[PDB]
Nucleic acid binder design. Structure first.
Lengths: 90, 23, 90
DNA sequence: TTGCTTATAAATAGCTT
DNA sequence: AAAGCTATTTATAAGCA
């Protein structure tokens, strides 16, 4: 971007809506890429303030979530709290 | 760099009954 | 990247594993960003060939997946094709 | 692998209007 | 909330330490 921006709730509701749309797309774009590049399935679920649901699925959303439900073994599970720290490092 | 257990154990249960019936 | 790469199953299993890890992180990073910037909840579910599960949640996978049980009407859903498609169209 | 380093390819903040 | 357009900031293929 033409200027560096910290990561914190964009205040101007106008700009916080222009950005949600722009990025949401890029996010899904990368998802899709990661999906094809490394041949893996991905489900992406987004919820905005107004609780409007947005989603993506490399192929089918119902399939991925199902497989997910019946998945009891362990696995990598991150959060923003986590991600924030992992970033405070490199 | 924290890993962790499955995402949930109960919620996963509720999520499923839904997904299936959604048919 | 130091060179442009098409998007198709990375063949060299070595490189297709280095990339999965690198990107998967960046993806989650952006998710996290979109999450904080536009104050919205996001769940990200990844599955590799070996069916190893990887996931992210702006706060807790519990909340979202559960919160996805109520408002199940996706104001926007996308498949790998929509994206692929929307990629040229524009 | 196990990583760090660093050119290039990419994503995008802030303007037009 | 809508489209392009840089100027810059990021994300990252290859390198090679």
């Amino acid at each position: 971007g033409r200027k560096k921006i910290q990561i914190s709730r964009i205040l101007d509701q106008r700009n916080r809506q222009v950005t949600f749309t722009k990025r949401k797309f890029g996010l899904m774009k990368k998802a899709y890429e990661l999906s094809v590049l490394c041949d893996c399935e991905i489900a992406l679920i987004i919820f905005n303030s107004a609780n409007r649901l947005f989603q993506y699925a490399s192929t089918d959303m119902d399939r991925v979530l199902l497989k997910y439900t019946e998945y009891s073994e362990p696995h990598e599970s991150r959060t923003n709290t986590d991600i924030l720290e992992t970033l405070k490092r490199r | 760099s924290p890993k962790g257990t499955g995402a949930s154990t109960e919620v996963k249960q509720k999520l499923q009954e839904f997904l299936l019936s959604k048919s």
